[PDB]
Amino acid sequence: SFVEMVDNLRGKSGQGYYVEMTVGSPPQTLNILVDTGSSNFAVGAAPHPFLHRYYQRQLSSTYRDLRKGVYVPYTQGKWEGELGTDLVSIPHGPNVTVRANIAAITESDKFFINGSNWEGILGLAYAEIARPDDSLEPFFDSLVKQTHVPNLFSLQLCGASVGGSMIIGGIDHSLYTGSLWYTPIRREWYYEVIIVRVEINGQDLKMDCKEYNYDKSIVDSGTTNLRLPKKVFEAAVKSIKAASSTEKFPDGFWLGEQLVCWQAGTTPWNIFPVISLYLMGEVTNQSFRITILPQQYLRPVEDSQDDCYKFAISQSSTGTVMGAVIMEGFYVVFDRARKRIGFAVSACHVHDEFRTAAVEGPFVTLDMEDCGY
Ligand SMILES: CCCc1cc(CNC[C@@H](O)[C@@H]2C[C@H](C)CCCCCCOCC(=O)N(C)[C@@H](C)C(=O)N2)n[nH]1
Numbered sequence: 377s378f379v380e381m382v383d384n385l386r387g388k389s390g391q392g393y394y395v396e397m398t399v400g401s402p403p404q405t406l407n408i409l410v411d412t413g414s415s416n417f418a419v420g421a422a423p424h425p426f427l428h429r430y431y432q433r434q435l436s437s438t439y440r441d442l443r444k445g446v447y448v449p450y451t452q453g454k455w456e457g458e459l460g461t462d463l464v465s466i467p468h469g470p471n472v473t474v475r476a477n478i479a480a481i482t483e484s485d486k487f488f489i490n491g492s493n494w495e496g497i498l499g500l501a502y503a504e505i506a507r508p509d510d511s512l513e514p515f516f517d518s519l520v521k522q523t524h525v526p527n528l529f530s531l532q533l534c535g536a537s538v539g540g541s542m543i544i545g546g547i548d549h550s551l552y553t554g555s556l557w558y559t560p561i562r563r564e565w566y567y568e569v570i571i572v573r574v575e576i577n578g579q580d581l582k583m584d585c586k587e588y589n590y591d592k593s594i595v596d597s598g599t600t601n602l603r604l605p606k607k608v609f610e611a612a613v614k615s616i617k618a619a620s621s622t623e624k625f626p627d628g629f630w631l632g633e634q635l636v637c638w639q640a641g642t643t644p645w646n647i648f649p650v651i652s653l654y655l656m657g658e659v660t661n662q663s664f665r666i667t668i669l670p671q672q673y674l675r676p677v678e679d680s681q682d683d684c685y686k687f688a689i690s691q692s693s694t695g696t697v698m699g700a701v702i703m704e705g706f707y708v709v710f711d712r713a714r715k716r717i718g719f720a721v722s723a724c725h726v727h728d729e730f731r732t733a734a735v736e737g738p739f740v741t742l743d744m745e746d747c748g749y
Pocket residue numbers: 390391392409411413414415448449450451452453487497505506507596598599600601
């Protein structure tokens with residue numbers, strides 16, 4: 377039944393993926409960013425320079441005011457607003473209508489993006505990280521309780537402006553090739569996973585695997601970059617520098633600040649390494665790996681005809697984040713019902729002429745529990 381939802385995501389590179397929703401009676405139409413790294417459903421509800429439209433509570437007969445305040449500070453950007461409920465639908469989703477919590481955003485700082493074309497956010501993680509506290513039932517929890525939609529969804533994010541699919545309630549088998557590989561959701565707050573091994577161009581980073589998950593590892597469609605803990609970031613960048621030392625880059629390129637540009641079609645893909653992340657498997661001493669190409673972590677940006685890119689691996693102090701750059705080209709199943717996350721090569725996967733992004737296993741990996749922090 378899922379063909380209806382295929383290709384229901386749009387977006388600009390670096391600006392997230394959104395799906396179309398309606399809120400209120402009569403339905404008000406809004407483009408809503410899909411974020412697996414937060415748990416609040418919130419929409420613009422007041423004029424803003426960057427908003428093309430917004431939720432108008434006064435015009436919805438089914439709007440109910442909860443008369444509680446709310447704010448969410450993300451890793452970057454934040455908003456505050458008023459809690460309420462209203463009827464919500466997803467036109468290119470399941471044919472259902474749910475009464476859901478909505479945060480009507482009244483003030484924001486570094487949240488809305490100039491010309492981004494979305495006006496709100498759909499936090500698909502668990503109640504445990506919802507603001508103001510875990511009693512605000514997240515949207516997807518409301519969907520499963522009030523309807524027959526099965527308790528899972530999948531994300532196919534495609535690279536470059538960009539599009540993809542969010543299959544709500546199941547898995548669409550025409551969206552991926554090969555097998556799905558599953559990793560346990562370590563704890564139901566973020567979508568937390570355990571990275572057990574890291575390789576760059578086949579060479580093991582040889583760190584205590586706890587460093588990869590310090591203090592957590594999450595799968596986050598609302599973050600653009602692969603973000604790494606300080607110690608792991610340094611090892612990775614030192615390794616990517618040595619692999620690409622045939623050319624010289626400003627020390628501000630490795631910090632994500634400056635671009636790098638090449639004459640179009642002359643991007644030296646072969647001098648940047650592939651990165652392999654090994655994730656804990658479903659059986660004892662078993663793992664699998666995802667391999668990332670430079671076409672994923674060198675994110676294309678707008679300028680000439682030179683091809684320009686920003687380095688989309690950045691340093692973190694709140695753990696590893698497998699952002700949109702990692703998820704591009706994979707089909708990712710958020711199997712909440714079975715507390716696991718599946719990866720497979722997407723139908724829109726990233727490959728150059730000599731290397732290919734992959735999802736391969738099984739691997740044997742010893743002492744995987746020691747990798748949790
Ligand atoms: C109450 C939860 C608190 C909590 C969750 C997280 C982890 N998950 C973070 C994501 O929810 C947000 C979501 C975004 C703010 C949504 C708007 C921007 C969309 C694309 C822009 O991409 C830039 C980027 O990568 N941003 C901004 C990240 C650093 C970032 O903060 N992303 N930390 N804290």
